[PDB]
Amino acid sequence: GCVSIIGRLHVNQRASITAYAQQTRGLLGAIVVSMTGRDRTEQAGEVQILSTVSQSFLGTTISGVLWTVYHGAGNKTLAGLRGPVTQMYSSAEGDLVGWPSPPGTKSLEPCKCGAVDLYLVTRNADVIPARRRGDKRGALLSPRPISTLKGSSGGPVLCPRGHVVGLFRAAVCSRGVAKSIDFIPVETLDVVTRSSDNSTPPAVPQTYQVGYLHAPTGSGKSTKVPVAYAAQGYKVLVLNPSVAATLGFGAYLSKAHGINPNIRTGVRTVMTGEAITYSTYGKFLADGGCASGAYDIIICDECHAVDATSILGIGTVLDQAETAGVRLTVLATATPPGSVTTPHPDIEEVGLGREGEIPFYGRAIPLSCIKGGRHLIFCHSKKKCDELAAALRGMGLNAVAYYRGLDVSIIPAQGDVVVVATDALMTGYTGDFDSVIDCNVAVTQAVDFSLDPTFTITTQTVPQDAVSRSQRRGRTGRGRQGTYRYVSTGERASGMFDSVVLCECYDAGAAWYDLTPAETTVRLRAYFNTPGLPVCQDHLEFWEAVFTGLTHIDAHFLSQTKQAGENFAYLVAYQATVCARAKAPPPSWDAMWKCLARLKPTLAGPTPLLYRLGPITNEVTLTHPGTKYIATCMQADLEVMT
Ligand SMILES: [Mg+2]
Ligand SMILES: [Mg+2]
Ligand SMILES: [Zn+2]
């Protein structure tokens, strides 16, 4: 996972800027350099064309530092003369990354003459003129298709004298037309060049503050630390994403410390009067958020969690805490952004070799590892799960596949078994195993602003990050020894998540907590405004607008889509109510649309399509005012990362 250089730009003064582009390395070279992390060849130019094999982007060297965007390079090293080169600067919040610039490269100078005329140099050596709009943007003289600007993030935005005004990072669009340019000002680069240690619990301040606790899981941050706070006379609230963890901590304190704390969950609530409360983020929200004068300290545990409820809970805390009388909010996680996973007690970790009986993502599984006992194998796709469970059964093993669409009772409670599953198991299941085998491949949700007619919710296959890695291997060694086998080390904990998550929050907020869109915004704003958390593109105003227009949802449909656990229960249920009210069928007849089963014989004609949540089987009309509303929301200036 190294970044390699596959080309370069020469940027000099004669529009007065001239640029020349030069491809220098193909796909074989990029893969090899990327895998070895070694590049022995000479370097040159003011801008570098960078590659992660799949995708490509730019980097500009200024003051001996090769700068580029975080949304392209992440936490990756740069291939170098001697081997991998680690980042010298890194800010997900600034969407910025920097390495020491390879020798042979030339620097551009920052602009200190405050020009209005701006010039973007693309990956193809095109110079695009613009005019400055405030601090981080420019209005293009000639609007252009957004497609022409993709792959050029990290390129320089120049003044008429050739100094760098900023780094191109995104386009501001009007339904696919790029009207303006968004960039990282050079002034941001200076600030970043000046910057640690959260290892131990923050002290309780005299006035409200947010603090941080970065320590391993089970280390006691969820048990010992609350007790230490309470023993000083404070009332403590501990929030976790899962029911099992919440219940688990309560039971521990009882059995081990002889302390019986309060427990609040949807499935079980126990109030004892103690000064320590354990709750889920979900139950915390359903309870109305922060109650006045109830707690001195709120600990937001597992704050690397980017599921909708976790984000809403955390953002609610950060918005309401101070006013409710809290002295200290603690944001606690083992895997903060940019961090690696570290070994965990009792869990042996052993990379897979190339020898065995069952091929597995470029490695092999020996039968010995899984014959006898209970084992969990993570596969990236339904298709692969079925294939593998089949192959194992033909070798005399009790193997069984699990993915979304199947029940969890398919998994025997005891006796020998090999479960081969997707991440669907995480939400769907609770129990654990004697070992985990991990393909280290992650499938994540993404939104595509596709304009066919509006937005599409689809997926992405990416290398596993530290958070994912921890979750999967956490499925073994619960209370006792476990074993974790893997194909590769992943990437460091991601500092950035997709816009589709925002969509998920507004959906969940409305579906599960009756939150108004304007109110969901306030809470997400708190989340964004707090440093040290994962960041996102600011599409809050966009998503607020579209959900505001989705009025008068059929309650019965919303109920069923909720039972069925649809990640976007509200968007689905809503699509179903327009179809029903139109006497039209759903876009397909996937299980997604169960709720419309009984009415099938009564529906016909084209479906009024609002957005795409999956494949389309039936004829569709783009006519519904619901479609036109969402579509006109997308005409408003929308920042698209490039
Ligand atoms: Mg603990
Ligand atoms: Mg943790
Ligand atoms: Zn200048």
Numbering used by the authors: -15 to -2, 1 to 181, 185 to 631
Show me the paper's own sentences about this structure.
Hepatitis C viruses (HCV) encode a helicase enzyme that is essential for viral replication and assembly (nonstructural protein 3 [NS3]). NS3 contains the typical structural features of a superfamily 2 (SF2) helicase, including the conserved sequence motifs for ATP hydrolysis and RNA recognition. These are arranged within two paradigmatic helicase domains, each of which adopts the RecA fold architecture that is typical for SF2 helicases. Two additional domains contribute to NS3 function, i.e., domain 3, which contains additional motifs for RNA binding and unwinding, and an N-terminally appended protease domain, which enhances helicase activity via a large, positively charged patch that contributes to high-affinity RNA binding.
To carry out the structural studies, we used a conventional “single-chain” construct design in which JFH-1 NS4A amino acids 21 to 34 were fused via a short GSGS linker to the N terminus of JFH-NS3, yielding a full-length NS3 protein in which the β-sheet of the protease domain is stabilized and activated by intercalation of the NS4A fragment. The resulting crystals diffracted to 2.23 Å, in space group P21 21 21, and there is one molecule in the asymmetric unit (ASU). The overall JFH-1 NS3-4A structure is composed of four globular domains arranged in a tetrahedral fashion, as observed previously for gt1b NS3-4A. However, there is a pronounced shift in the position of D2, which is caused by a 9.6° twist in the conserved β14/15 hairpin (amino acids 430 to 452). The twist in the β hairpin propagates into a displacement of D2, altering its position by about 8.7 Å relative to the location of D2 in gt1b structures. Most importantly, the displacement of D2 drives it closer to the protease domain, creating a more narrow, concave area of positively charged residues between D2 and the protease domain. This positive cleft would be expected to improve early, productive contacts with RNA and to confine it in a specific orientation, potentially contributing to the faster and stronger RNA binding by JFH-1 NS3. Similarly, the conserved RNA binding motifs IV (residues 365 to 372) and V (residues 411 to 419) also shift outward by 6.8 Å and 4.2 Å, respectively. Together, these structural differences expand the length of the RNA binding tunnel and would enable JFH-1 NS3 to accommodate one more nucleotide than gt1b NS3, potentially explaining the higher RNA affinity and processivity of the JFH1 variant. In contrast, the RNA binding tunnel in apo-JFH-1 NS3-4A is completely open, resulting in unobstructed access to the RNA binding cleft. The shifted position of D2 prevents the formation of H bonds between Arg393, Gly554, and Glu555 in JFH-1 NS3-4A and frees the cleft to form a known set of interactions with the backbone of single-stranded RNA.
